[PDB]
């Protein structure tokens, strides 16, 4: 009734609020499995002490995971421990016997640690490094197109069944791409000085492109162009304007190391210094 009905319609608070959730459906084992398994335990006379279960419904798990994957948090399922999302063992849908659930929500949680770490990395650049700042920019530009798909699925919940095995296979070309950054970043946090910590990360990309000369190569190629742009600018300013400016010693040439310019490096240095020597006449 009047205001409470408006609430009861458009709110899904049954797990955002303390009230045991109930879905009106067809019951009897094909969707009553959790109750069936509990009853089998009790008939076998454990004697008691069951698990912590409070029953969410099916689609809401998917809404929940889509929000985690797009990047947002403050989520009841996939509870944080210090920032790291971990599987909740206090909830069940109405099936999956409370142990299968603990595996499959854990695999989404294992992806979610990677996504929280990437957003943590992008967060720690706003609160320049000329390569790290240039790398989070590419990661962020990819993250936009990645977030768009999560948003579009979240729209059509109100507009087909919603379940786990459809959404996992639906996000296959993204859950693949998530694993490559898990390997790229390990050399990007291996790190002393700003120029070798940057050359390490940049040379990882320069190697991995030659490795597969798919979709992974498009990912690495999009990471590569948007990290060498400050260097291409800095090379151009030393070459044509004559004067060497490389303060903080972030410029890789100091008047690991990438071989992007090694077969022509003699001519680079002998071009820049000679332009500076043209300015003195």
């Amino acid at each position: 009734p009047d205001d409470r009905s408006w609430l009861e319609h458009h709110v899904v608070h049954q797990y955002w609020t303390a009230r045991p959730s109930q879905f009106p459906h067809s019951l009897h084992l094909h969707s009553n499995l959790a109750a069936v398994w509990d009853q089998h335990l009790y008939s076998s006379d454990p004697l008691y002490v069951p698990d912590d279960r409070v029953l969410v419904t099916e689609t809401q798990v998917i809404r929940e995971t889509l929000w985690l994957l797009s990047g947002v948090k403050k989520l009841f399922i996939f509870q944080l421990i210090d920032g790291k999302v971990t599987v909740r063992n206090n909830i069940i849908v109405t099936h999956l016997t409370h142990s299968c659930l603990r595996s499959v929500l854990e695999q989404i949680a294992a992806y979610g640690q990677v996504v929280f770490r990437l957003q943590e990395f992008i967060d720690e650049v706003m609160g320049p490094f000329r390569t790290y700042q240039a790398f989070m920019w590419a990661l962020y530009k990819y993250f936009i197109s990645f977030k768009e798909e999560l948003a579009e699925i979240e729209k059509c919940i109100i507009n087909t069944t919603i379940t786990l095995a459809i959404v996992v296979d639906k996000l296959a070309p993204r859950l693949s791409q998530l694993k490559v950054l898990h390997k790229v970043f390990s050399t990007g946090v291996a790190e002393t000085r700003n120029v070798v910590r940057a050359s390490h990360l940049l040379n990882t990309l320069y190697k991995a492109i030659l490795e597969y000369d798919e979709q992974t190569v498009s990912l690495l190629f999009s990471l590569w162009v948007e990290t060498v742009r400050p260097y291409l600018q800095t090379v151009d300013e030393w070459i044509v304007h004559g004067h060497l400016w490389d303060g903080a010693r972030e410029f890789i040439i100091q008047r690991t190391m990438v071989s992007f310019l090694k077969p022509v490096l003699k001519q680079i240095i002998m071009a820049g210094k000679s332009m500076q020597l043209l300015k003195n006449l």
Binding site: D3, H10, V12, F23, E58, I158, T161
Partner: protein, 214 residues
């Protein structure tokens, strides 16, 4: 009759838990994604909770109505200059409303300063002031018929700040004659590149038209 009703399309929103015929009945919609009626209800509900936390001394009757177009027609009448039912001399509406309402209240105090048809140059200067006031009353009801609520505040921002600058120009002491002719020139030397450069120039250009006749 029964077979005639039969030829219909059955809904989707399938459910996993219904194994015995799951067509669709909506597993609880989202709060924002039922908008334009939940919105005004939510504002009204918050206003009720705010009035509860005080005791009824923040009571402002009709928390809804005026809606959008009525509120736009009201502010169009205020943009003509004339006062509204709420001015004498939805709860975020006050913050948006004040910015254009103050523009109207200073527009009227320029028209009151144009009640005249004393200074000879002052008369020509007032006749030049009416050349801007006519623009301000002419642009409304040729640009905004009943357009979007935020569009009005954005549109009369580039034009309204200049009107507020002219409100700082007028006194409502205020000089008259050659003292006014010098006062405006010092205002010319004060600002020359913001937006008020052609406006101040066009006022000064007719404030010296009678003095050259001497």
């Amino acid at each position: 009759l029964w077979e005639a009703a039969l030829t219909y399309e059955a809904s989707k929103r399938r459910c996993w838990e219904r194994v015995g015929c799951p067509p669709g009945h909506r597993e609880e919609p989202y709060l924002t994604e039922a908008g334009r009626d939940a919105f005004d209800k939510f504002c009204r509900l918050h206003q009720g909770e705010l009035q509860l936390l005080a005791g009824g001394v923040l009571q402002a009757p009709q928390p809804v109505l005026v809606k959008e177009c009525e509120l736009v027609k009201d502010v169009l009448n205020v943009l003509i200059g004339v006062v509204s039912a709420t001015f004498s001399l939805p709860e975020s509406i006050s913050s948006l409303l004040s910015e254009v309402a103050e523009y109207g209240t200073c527009y009227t105090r320029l028209s009151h300063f144009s009640l005249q048809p004393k200074g000879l140059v002052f008369q020509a200067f007032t006749s030049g002031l009416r050349r801007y006031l006519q623009y301000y009353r002419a642009c409304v009801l040729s640009t905004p018929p009943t357009l979007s609520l935020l569009t009005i505040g954005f549109l009369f921002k580039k034009l309204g700040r200049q009107l507020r600058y002219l409100a700082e120009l007028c006194g409502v002491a205020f000089p008259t004659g050659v003292k006014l002719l010098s006062y405006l020139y010092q205002e010319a030397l004060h600002n020359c590149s913001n937006e008020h450069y052609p406006v101040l120039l066009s006022l000064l250009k007719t404030s010296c038209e009678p003095y050259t006749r001497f």
